[PDB]
């Protein structure tokens, strides 16, 4: 496979390839989480960066539509895509973000463009310690960001004021 | 002794008492950290709350003078009393606040009036865990608040915007 992950978006190749014009091909699907966004059949000689370029315009259109739909700090529209329980200031009913929810706001392909190391620096923590927030393959056994650090990070990123 | 601590202020009794009007007396000194603020000789039958009431007006005058001198969030003037290294957003040159600096902003006698348990709730942590930030008698071996939690707390208290 070797799926391509661009923030909260993913591009996945089909299990079984195809053949077109005497060359191997593959059907790639672009998803926003579970939501199927687009499909394109592309040659096998394509680098992953070439596939990312192929789907970048659909991603940018997603961003434009979300900016208009969820119109405050400059990136407040991102809060329209996050569940209320990760945004609430009631710590008793708050829950930490999932990896996908975090990748909405951290990562070069995130909607903020801020890398993991830069976000770690914004929180005063090492990049290796911040990497744990998206590490592993177990949601339940994955390091969770703290309430205070999450809301502080959302303030520093211009997504939601801590107020 | 049994000194009285009111946020960053302390009232200390003299080692050797005195006698006035056939009754035991003690000379109490009110300090703001190391700064001697006032002296009053008061009877031994005074409760600690009575001594606190005796010095409360001088404390309130301190607050008025600081509010005027360090005039933004409503309690921004408190930042005039805190060293720059605990206020800086450069995590590489930041240092955590001391217990005294923390008691500027947390505690019923602090300049915010917000209790330790309420501040803990503002940070999403238990009161017992927050108590560790002012526990013990060793500055070096005292639990330190994190960069993100400290700046988030200062934002939630109305002392300094996280921006």
Numbering used by the authors:
A (entry chain A), B (entry chain A): 1 to 71, 137 to 228
Please quote the paper that reports this structure.
CRISPR-Cas systems are prokaryotic adaptive immune systems and phages use anti-CRISPR proteins (Acrs) to counteract these systems. In the type I-F system, after pre-crRNA is transcribed, Cas6f processes the pre-crRNA into small crRNAs, binds it, and further assembles with one Cas8f, one Cas5f, and six Cas7f proteins to generate the crRNA-guided surveillance complex (Csy complex). AcrIF24 targets the Cas7f subunits by engaging up to five Cas7f subunits (Cas7.2f-7.6 f), sterically blocks access to the crRNA guide by the complementary target DNA, and induces non-sequence-specific DNA binding to the Csy complex. AcrIF24 forms a homodimer and further induces dimerization of the Csy complex.
During the process of structure determination, we found that the residues ranging from 73 to 135 of AcrIF24 tend to be disordered, with electronic density too weak to model the structure of this region. Therefore, we made another AcrIF24 construct (AcrIF24 Δmiddle domain, short for AcrIF24ΔMD hereafter) by deleting this region and linking the remaining two parts of the protein with a “GSGSSG” linker. We solved its crystal structure to a resolution of 2.10 Å. There is only one AcrIF24ΔMD molecule in the asymmetric unit. The structure of AcrIF24ΔMD revealed a two-domain architecture, with an extended N-terminal domain (residues 1–72, NTD) and a globular C-terminal domain (residues 136–228, CTD). The NTD comprises a five-stranded antiparallel β sheet and a bent α helix. The CTD comprises five α helices and a single 310 helix. In the structure, the two helices ranging from residue 181–198 of AcrIF24CTD (colored orange), almost perpendicular to each other, constitute an HTH motif, linked by the characteristic sharp turn (residues 189–191). In the crystal, two AcrIF24 protomers with twofold symmetry interact with each other with several hydrophobic interactions from their CTDs, extending to a length of ~113 Å. The results showed that mutating F212/H216/Y217 to either alanines or glutamates changed AcrIF24ΔMD to monomers as indicated by the assays of gel filtration chromatography.
